[PDB]
Amino acid sequence: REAICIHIGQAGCQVGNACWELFCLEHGIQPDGAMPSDKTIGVEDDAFNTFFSETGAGKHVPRAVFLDLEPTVVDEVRTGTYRQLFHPEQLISGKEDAANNYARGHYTIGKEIVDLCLDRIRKLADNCTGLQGFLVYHAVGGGTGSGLGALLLERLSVDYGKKSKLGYTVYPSPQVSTAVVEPYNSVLSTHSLLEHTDVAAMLDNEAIYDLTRRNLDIERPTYTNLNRLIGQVVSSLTASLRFDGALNVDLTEFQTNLVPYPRIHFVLTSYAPVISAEKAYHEQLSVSEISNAVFEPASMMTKCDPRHGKYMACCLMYRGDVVPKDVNAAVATIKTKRTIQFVDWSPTGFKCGINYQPPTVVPGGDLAKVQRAVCMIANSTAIAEVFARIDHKFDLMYSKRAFVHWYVGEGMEEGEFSEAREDLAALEKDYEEVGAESADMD
Amino acid sequence: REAICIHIGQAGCQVGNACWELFCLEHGIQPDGAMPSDKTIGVEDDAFNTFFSETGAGKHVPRAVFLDLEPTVVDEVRTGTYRQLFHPEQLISGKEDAANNYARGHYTIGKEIVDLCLDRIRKLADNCTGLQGFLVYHAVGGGTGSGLGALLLERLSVDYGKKSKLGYTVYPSPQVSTAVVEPYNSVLSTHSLLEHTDVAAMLDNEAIYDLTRRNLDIERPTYTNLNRLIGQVVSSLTASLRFDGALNVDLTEFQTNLVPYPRIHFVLTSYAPVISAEKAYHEQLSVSEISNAVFEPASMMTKCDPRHGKYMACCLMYRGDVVPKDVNAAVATIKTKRTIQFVDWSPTGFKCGINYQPPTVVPGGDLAKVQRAVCMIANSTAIAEVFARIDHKFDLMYSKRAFVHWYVGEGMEEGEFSEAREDLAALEKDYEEVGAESADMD
Amino acid sequence: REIVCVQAGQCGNQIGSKFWEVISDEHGVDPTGTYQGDSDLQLERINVYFDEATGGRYVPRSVLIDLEPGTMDSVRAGPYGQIFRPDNFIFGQSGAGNNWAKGHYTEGAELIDSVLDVCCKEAESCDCLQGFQICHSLGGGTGSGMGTLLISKLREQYPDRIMMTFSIIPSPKVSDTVVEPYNTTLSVHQLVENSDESMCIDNEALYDICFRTLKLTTPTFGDLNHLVSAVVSGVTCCLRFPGQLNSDLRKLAVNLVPFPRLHFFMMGFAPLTSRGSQQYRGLSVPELTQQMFDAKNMMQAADPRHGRYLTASALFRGRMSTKEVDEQMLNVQNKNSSYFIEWIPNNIKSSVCDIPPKGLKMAVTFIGNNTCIQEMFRRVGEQFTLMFRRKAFLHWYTGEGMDEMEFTEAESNMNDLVSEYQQYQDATIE
Amino acid sequence: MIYSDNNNPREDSVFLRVKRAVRCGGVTGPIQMVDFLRDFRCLEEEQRASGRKGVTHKQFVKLMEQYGTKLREGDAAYLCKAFDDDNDGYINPERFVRHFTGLNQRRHNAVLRAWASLPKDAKGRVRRNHLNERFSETVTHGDVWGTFSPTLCFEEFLAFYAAVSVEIPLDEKFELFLLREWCADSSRAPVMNSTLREWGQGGDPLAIGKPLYVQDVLDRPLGLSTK
Amino acid sequence: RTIYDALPKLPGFSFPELNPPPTNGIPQLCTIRKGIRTVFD
Amino acid sequence: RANREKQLLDYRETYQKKETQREWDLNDPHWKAKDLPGRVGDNDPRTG
Amino acid sequence: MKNSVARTQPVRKYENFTLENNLPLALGANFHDDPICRDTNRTSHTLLLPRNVDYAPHTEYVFNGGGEPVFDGWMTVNFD
Ligand SMILES: Nc1nc2c(ncn2[C@@H]2O[C@H](COP(=O)(O)OP(=O)(O)OP(=O)(O)O)[C@@H](O)[C@H]2O)c(=O)[nH]1
Ligand SMILES: Nc1nc2c(ncn2[C@@H]2O[C@H](COP(=O)(O)OP(=O)(O)OP(=O)(O)O)[C@@H](O)[C@H]2O)c(=O)[nH]1
Ligand SMILES: Nc1nc2c(ncn2[C@@H]2O[C@H](COP(=O)(O)OP(=O)(O)O)[C@@H](O)[C@H]2O)c(=O)[nH]1
Ligand SMILES: [Mg+2]
Ligand SMILES: [Mg+2]
């Protein structure tokens, strides 16, 4: 029943703003924290409970924390439209940023703020009766997102136990870039995140910009569009807990079906009916068409091509007016294709889910209104190319000690670079060996 | 049941405008695809399905793609009268033309644009359940039509396999000409088309100009008249799939009946009641008169005289009020003629088709209204004379390497000119050998 | 002679809801629990599936178990949900995660004592107890683990009753779960030792029933669960209505199982027909028999033409003569003699019941024991061997605590079962 | 909810809030909705009389505020652009009327059948005094008589019964409610069992009359034992 | 009572969309609390 | 079902207009026609 | 089919039928196959499309055939 959301840093807080806007409009909680006048004890109305808790006066408040080291974005939330929705204690802000240094966030500044975060999460977890996981939003490219996200996941992993941790992560794009030190922060973040996360979903802004240019008709997209697409995908994955359906899927089922070996937990995500209102009237949108859509790499939100690897497992979530025979026929048609290949040790490659609630439409949004949608998260060996490309840039920079004095000055041993780089080399070797056919292995 | 149309370049898109105008008016779909505000379905019957698909709301959209490297012609389609009929993804346009170079279309630019075209055609083929062939319209005289048409037919032949591919091709007229480099492009096109096409129908503008001067009363014809005649021919050949009749003919039957050896697949086309309104009320138009008309060279849409060769197979399609006994009597009378000769190894030279739907009348058209028509496609050795004249003009220019540096600059080896020239020489020898009497060889 | 039902997991609870709707309709019980039937013949055997409550109410002899209450909350909120006794819902606080080891060892042992307490309270209340009936899927997590745990405990506690199971098994073409081979193999290993008779259903076969026979344009899981509810309520129909030739679950088991390991059967139900076709064919015993043996009407992917029938049973509902039933079963055995095991002189048992289901003049349910079921087990064992050689996803199961020897034993036992079927298929008198 | 399910795909959240505000304000809600439609019609008539082609945005939002809509930032412009077709600062009346009295397909057909049941005269318009005594004992929602301006047209009828649609969450219950409210059930083609069905040639499963026993056929006296 | 439900319960005679649910949520009618199960309606 | 999809099309046509989107000021064609240059004349109030 | 679900098998006329006009099916008298006697020539996939029905249902189906004295002393006798 309950799930707690943790939002970290700039991308994570802005995506949180889009997500809670969506969850409010889908359940019907007004921006001032009030159920509409037509809802009473006359009918059973509890679906919000997965994301909201009600006070004794009947106000709703959401099960989320917003974490930042700079005040500006949380002060924008405090002064914005949803001022009365959030409890003021939930919006925690420090004085100064981690300045793109993972070392500054982890060692110098996040250690001061971390105890307040654990106390707030504990205060939330005490007001629950069926918590079944944490959802985490952060970027690994920046200093506070990487450092405080790693430190907080380590502390949560020590305090809590046998609880799932699912991450939605914005990785550095392969040629679009925002800062020079991106490789160092991404390597050290992925090194800490590898041991303490159960499934990690990867997003790339360059891919979602391509998707908004290609599918929608937006010539000059901005982060609010990207954040609305991310909100739709998270709403689709968590819809299985909140509404009636033929085949529900608990968050623990994702880790069981998608992860074959404990280090192989990075998955691709895609969404099918990303379409504009003008295109929506030229096409029918049947189950088989959107099922065919989720497998094209042009539909993915991470810049990787799955044709350079082999799939090990796929999880398909259908929501809306769908009939099981069409889901079965669609999955059977995909399996026939020769350019889609699965490793020979994974014969039963699919997991299915079917939910009746169609996706909600947001007043200023750019997606059309549709009766059905499908969302996919999948595990594939193609991910080795993403790490290989980050590692080449790391090797280029570290060969000349390009920026190391900053990291050593803020408290970190230089040895940590070599340890993380060796761990990523071993992860590359795992992805090389796992893809080897069994017939050649004898 | 269904067939997908691919339109390439300038001639193919302009002929496509006339074709879709006719197919809409014959089935009854409005030019915008909508329906009156009170009806629940725009038409009572599914017969349109061969060429159109309807959405669940009842809008119609057609099964076609338009491919061009210059934007102007596709932008004219986007801004014309049928703007709402086509899905915007189907109208594909590049930035710059193939500049009359087969090498530029095939190696440099069509190689870049071809994957979008294949993705659109795949999206059409996934929304089908009994696809029985591709229809292709292009001219082999220009650069993008030749180069991208050949490259796309090669890729289609690998991906779809056994499915039939029927081409309508505009070849360079024997004395009317538009560009200097026509022989090189036509030779290299014919070289690619030999391996990767099941039946190719050849058209020459000089023949349609002669037909419009003698039969119609047009002193100043333009391409729209020729394109309306071509659309009528395509409608006649595909009518057998869409309306009731005595003897139906599926698109797979043409290849089986017309092609004796895998290289001998080039056919002549003619149409009988091409007549003006003032002549139509001075003459009766019985079955035997139009059957006698189809064998006269004044009726042909290709500039070749079949009296200088031998027929291998003929396919006669009758549509309208015709009775089978009259068709049999007419064909026996044609068989009696002395200027019509069949190779002695082909005793059963004819295939017949009879359909009840008479030809449609288009509001701005120039053809009269008639109760019946017949269309013929036939394989004859006379076609060898067209290639001999193209090959002689190629030999004249190639003796001094007159323009080869453009083709070599755009990516092609000089060896490809010589290879294509020996393959067309071998095709000429094939037409000499197939025409040798068996009684003469003992 | 009353049966106690157990529904486990999402599939089991959903099929159970439709079963109790069909049974409540046949005995005329309002969803409030009030009897509203129209013949005394309905009341005189109501005890078989219902227990009697004091006032104007009836309560159903069923135990509902699941590890997360989501499905139970959906069924309790349904239109017939009120009939169920509140104390009969047993639930934990975290899901099985579709993992057999978690469902069998950690939350299973936590809840099993409370489930056994409810099952014993229900069993010891009966004046004479007939067998238990269990519905669950084999590919899931709580269904497989807790279902097989409870089956093992009830076989220790009630070894003299009958144990019957309805089970959902993985389709040969598309998987619904990535880890199905492990859960299926361990569950089949537990069932072949513990069960007395087990019926297996492929969702793919029900899809083919819906598309080819009923031609439904937009089927839903309610239709598949209605077909299953129809056959399950049909096998027991002769237990609870009069007839010319009575039959019983124990008598069916005695006639169907030649050797104790050969207890896996196929099922079918005959008067399935599309809304357009009913004007073209009147009901008669030859028509029912022809549909009864048509593989299009069989709910498993394996086809009879690759195997042989050891035994089969047909239960007929309706007013009919015994001569046509007997002669139809003789004619089918004589005409298709190569598909029947020759060292048994008569493979089909027949039974006749007077009262058909409402709205049908006649109906028959078919149960078949055919050696072609060995190919399904062979396919599952192959996929298991492919996954185990590479230790596929194995760390979840090993992390819960299972010894790998369990996996090698279960694979070896199932492989011996396929070999045993193959040997009896090709056996000869000599 | 109502603006998210497939059953009512025409609904929008902000317009639903506007309708909720105009219904629950303040004479009951359906009366207020009929009054809102009447004010819209008279305003557009006055504007057409003046020489301007329709109601503008400013007086539209003024009317909404007059009926008590607690609008927010940007929603007024959202509705003004939503109902402006030519994009010239004017509100299209037919689109607004169609959306204002919107209903599901089943509910719309039920309302149409009920309306077709009642008799009319002159230019397709009913009068209260002719039919108030005939349907007095069967109309549970007595507000219908208050809606009469003793005259009423179809648009007011549809607005009134669209107002009450929120109180009945089931479509079948709404259909039966309306049919037994106005006695619109057809004798030839009924949908309820509690109606006087007339067949013309009797029901085809006419199992009444003859219980058809078997002992009334058998010849009992033949069973006597005599030599 | 009505022609929409006056048919016997046989396969192929069910029309699910004719009785559409007014809501799609999950109530909490089945809770654990501190270990004392409640199946309250 | 048919009328359901027709009403969905009505909703799309009337509530999701192109100019309604929040980011219309960036994606609007003719955006340079509606704007002013940096300085207009010699008494422009904007030139501080 | 994947078109709109509201389509139904069309209606055809086939006029000039001898069997409907009180005439024998004589040789050379099959006028209903003459294309001039049809109203349309459009082929429609009737094998996949459903049929049209209009009727008023039965609303109900029958399956059965339709079908103080306490003692407190004070004993009294009546001969009825
Ligand atoms: N999708 C998306 N990406 C964002 C967003 N904001 C920032 N990013 C991306 O994330 C990276 C920057 O990370 P930040 O979140 O700014 O880093 P930070 O967490 O603020 O760390 P500090 O700078 O030390 O405070 C760049 O690649 C940005 O493109 C957002 O709102 N949405
Ligand atoms: N019948 C007919 N012939 C046409 C038409 N348009 C062009 N042609 C002929 O086709 C040849 C020119 O080919 P184009 O289609 O212009 O070549 P293209 O496909 O545009 O190739 P690029 O010039 O490289 O862009 C000439 O012989 C023209 O006479 C037309 O509409 N109808
Ligand atoms: N026929 C049928 N199959 C179902 C139903 N619900 C789930 N299944 C199937 O059962 C399998 C999932 O098992 P599940 O019941 O979720 O296992 P659990 O998690 O242990 O309860 C999949 O193959 C589903 O397709 C249902 O109502 N009917
Ligand atoms: Mg920051
Ligand atoms: Mg051009």
TrEMBL record, chains A, B:
Primary role: Tubulin is the major constituent of microtubules, a cylinder consisting of laterally associated linear protofilaments composed of alpha- and beta-tubulin heterodimers. Microtubules grow by the addition of GTP-tubulin dimers to the microtubule end, where a stabilizing cap forms. Below the cap, tubulin dimers are in GDP-bound state, owing to GTPase activity of alpha-tubulin.
Give GO MF terms, alphabetically: GTP binding; hydrolase activity; structural constituent of cytoskeleton
* Keywords carried by this UniProt record: GTP-binding, Hydrolase, Magnesium, Microtubule, Nucleotide-binding
Question: GO terms for biological process?
Answer: microtubule cytoskeleton organization; mitotic cell cycle
Q: Tubulin/FtsZ 2-layer sandwich domain spans which residues?
A: 247-392
Q: Which domain of life is it from?
A: Eukaryota
Gene3D superfamilies the record matches: Helix hairpin bin (1.10.287.600), Tubulin/FtsZ, C-terminal domain (3.30.1330.20), Tubulin/FtsZ, GTPase domain (3.40.50.1440)
- Known partners and oligomeric status: Dimer of alpha and beta chains. A typical microtubule is a hollow water-filled tube with an outer diameter of 25 nm and an inner diameter of 15 nM. Alpha-beta heterodimers associate head-to-tail to form protofilaments running lengthwise along the microtubule wall with the beta-tubulin subunit facing the microtubule plus end conferring a structural polarity. Microtubules usually have 13 protofilaments but different protofilament numbers can be found in some organisms and specialized cells.
Q: Which reaction does it catalyse?
A: GTP + H2O = GDP + phosphate + H(+)
User: Tubulin/FtsZ GTPase domain: from which residue to which, for each copy?
Assistant: 48-245
Signal peptide position in this chain?
Answer: none
TrEMBL record, chain C:
Could you say which residues form the signal peptide? none
Task: Note the Gene3D superfamilies from the entry.
Answer: Helix hairpin bin (1.10.287.600), Tubulin/FtsZ, C-terminal domain (3.30.1330.20), Tubulin/FtsZ, GTPase domain (3.40.50.1440)
Instruction: Extract the SUPFAM superfamilies matched here.
Output: Tubulin C-terminal domain-like, Tubulin nucleotide-binding domain-like
Specify the superkingdom: Eukaryota
The entry describes its oligomerization and partners as: Dimer of alpha and beta chains. A typical microtubule is a hollow water-filled tube with an outer diameter of 25 nm and an inner diameter of 15 nM. Alpha-beta heterodimers associate head-to-tail to form protofilaments running lengthwise along the microtubule wall with the beta-tubulin subunit facing the microtubule plus end conferring a structural polarity. Microtubules usually have 13 protofilaments but different protofilament numbers can be found in some organisms and specialized cells.
Task of the protein: Tubulin is the major constituent of microtubules, a cylinder consisting of laterally associated linear protofilaments composed of alpha- and beta-tubulin heterodimers. Microtubules grow by the addition of GTP-tubulin dimers to the microtubule end, where a stabilizing cap forms. Below the cap, tubulin dimers are in GDP-bound state, owing to GTPase activity of alpha-tubulin.
Report what the protein is called.
Tubulin beta chain
Organism in which the protein naturally occurs: Trypanosoma brucei brucei (strain 927/4 GUTat10.1)
UniProtKB/TrEMBL annotation, chain D:
Q: Which UniProt keywords apply?
A: Calcium, Metal-binding, Repeat
Q: Is-annotated flag, keyword Repeat?
A: yes
What is any one of the record's Gene Ontology cellular component terms? axoneme
**From the UniProt record, which GO molecular function terms apply?**
calcium ion binding
Its domain of life reads Eukaryota
Q: Does the keyword Disulfide bond apply?
A: no
Q: Where is the EF-hand domain?
A: 71-106
Q: What is this protein called?
A: EF-hand domain-containing protein
This protein's species is Trypanosoma brucei brucei (strain 927/4 GUTat10.1)
Query: From which lineage does this chain's organism come?
Result: Eukaryota, Discoba, Euglenozoa, Kinetoplastea, Metakinetoplastina
From TrEMBL, chain E:
- Chain segments annotated as transmembrane: none
Task: State the compartments where it is located.
Answer: Cytoplasm, Cytoskeleton, Flagellum axoneme
Q: What is this protein called?
A: Rib72 protein-like protein
Annotated source species = Trypanosoma brucei brucei (strain 927/4 GUTat10.1)
